[PDB]
Amino acid sequence: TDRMIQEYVPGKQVTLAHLIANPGKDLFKKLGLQDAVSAIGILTITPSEASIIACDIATKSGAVEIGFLDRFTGAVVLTGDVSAVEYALKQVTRTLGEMMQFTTCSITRTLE
Amino acid sequence: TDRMIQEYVPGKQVTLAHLIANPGKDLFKKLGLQDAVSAIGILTITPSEASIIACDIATKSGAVEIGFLDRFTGAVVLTGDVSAVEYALKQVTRTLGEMMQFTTCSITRTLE
Amino acid sequence: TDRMIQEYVPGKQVTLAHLIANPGKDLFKKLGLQDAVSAIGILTITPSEASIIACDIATKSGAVEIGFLDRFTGAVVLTGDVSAVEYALKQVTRTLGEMMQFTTCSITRTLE
Amino acid sequence: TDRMIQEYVPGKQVTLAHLIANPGKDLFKKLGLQDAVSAIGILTITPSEASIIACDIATKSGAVEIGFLDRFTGAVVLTGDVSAVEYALKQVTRTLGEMMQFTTCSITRTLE
Amino acid sequence: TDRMIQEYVPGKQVTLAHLIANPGKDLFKKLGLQDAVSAIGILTITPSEASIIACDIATKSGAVEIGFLDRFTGAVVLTGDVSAVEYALKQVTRTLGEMMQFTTCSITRTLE
């Protein structure tokens, strides 16, 4: 019944920052990832273009590679040593949140 | 008509977690699923990237396979023994809900 | 002027459940439907993945076939005898609404 | 900044129902329309699947053809005699509005 | 925390109506525009199908051509003499706003 006009603009938020230490080979391949299976870091970012910035921060933080960047949805999958990927995820959230005023989530993990 | 700016960000929610014990061959095929027809588990997840995590929790929970993952829509279809898929769905919802503050739905079933 | 953050999640709703007893051949073909022209049942479902469940309920209800399933938008077109398609549409809304707490619309028809 | 979860579902609305008596050949061609240029009727419909119903009501109302149907966006372009397309647009809006509780717009025209 | 269902329908609005007298050749080509570089008129229109109407009004207003029409997003790029394109943009906003009750923006320009 009640009616309203909504002007949409993207928010600034890292919704997910999640570590999987030992993902399955099938999951890894279904994501289109190449190289030996490794730990992955998974980011959900709005606006979608901030994925570019998260990639730069992450790869500059240590020996982490971009598994994939999706500038259309904001998704980023990072690869590398599990502790390095964790450090990257932390740097991404630290930088976006503290220096660019994004809402950020805590780093979450799947280690088993 | 009232007017408001709405900054969009994805929520954190498992909206569907549904078991179909005996899906028809046509459906199973229209979904692009391969192998013999089996029970399927159907998940709807926001943000879409959390489908990756749900897949990991599911395949680690027992003898359940990824039928498909859609990181763009957040859909996951799981395959395996009906009881194993059921356990996987419960583990996805238990884990995302209790450990990651997602809103979760109850597990629903089509057994006939 | 006024500003708000909106966390989006899909609702649970069957918005359309509509019967067309005698659709035109041009409409039928433009929808990419095969076989002899027949009555059609048209569903609009959120979240999109619940289209899979609606298909299963519908095809289990009687001699109704999936014309198409669209798991990306939630659209389902059913085909068969007009009264069978009507029964299917009713079973879909009955099951989603009563057992899965979806908001459901009434079955609507175009018989002429 | 205030924050809210918004569960999305499509509304039921015909937002545009517009007659162009004499569209230019370039436009008619940029729309992918075939046959000789004719008057066109333009519909915007939510939910998108209701475009199927609008098409049926239109073609059954008289000598009007589907130029195209888009079940993804809900767009319908109708073709035929300008007066017949006009009658079709009025029948789409009368039927969806009175019989199916859609919000409907007034019919608008470009006659020059 | 707080939760609401939002039934979405498109608004009726021309958000952008902007003139660029001398766009760069690289910008012109990246937009996929053909012919000699010329001034461009840029429209943002909701619902997306109203782009069709804006095109018709614009091309009927004088010697303005459709650079492109995007019925999926509502974008229209017009080409021609800078003053003619300006006149077109004004006719589009005049007609949609005054005769079809769209919210319209003012015409904005980049002349240098």
Add this chain to the structure above:
Amino acid sequence: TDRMIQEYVPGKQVTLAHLIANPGKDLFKKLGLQDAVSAIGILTITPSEASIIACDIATKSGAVEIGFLDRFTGAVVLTGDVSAVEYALKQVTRTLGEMMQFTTCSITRTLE
């Protein structure tokens, strides 16, 4: 659960205006950018078509090139001398904000 109809229209906003002085070669390549790696400027703009205007303001402001434009998402990536890209980003935000009533973000930078 409360319910409301929301008519959607795009807002007018520059959400991101970000300088990366030294992006890695892999990122630069994953973005589909050609030529030698250079500093990049990253814009997020609503409505998406305003990316066209931002491009024009940027290339006219000095020796800055369009790496890419995305009129569907509103993304712009600029390339050139780090100081020139910075000036371009400031001119995009100054111009859209002061002359066209867009909400604008502050310019942000990754210099390390």
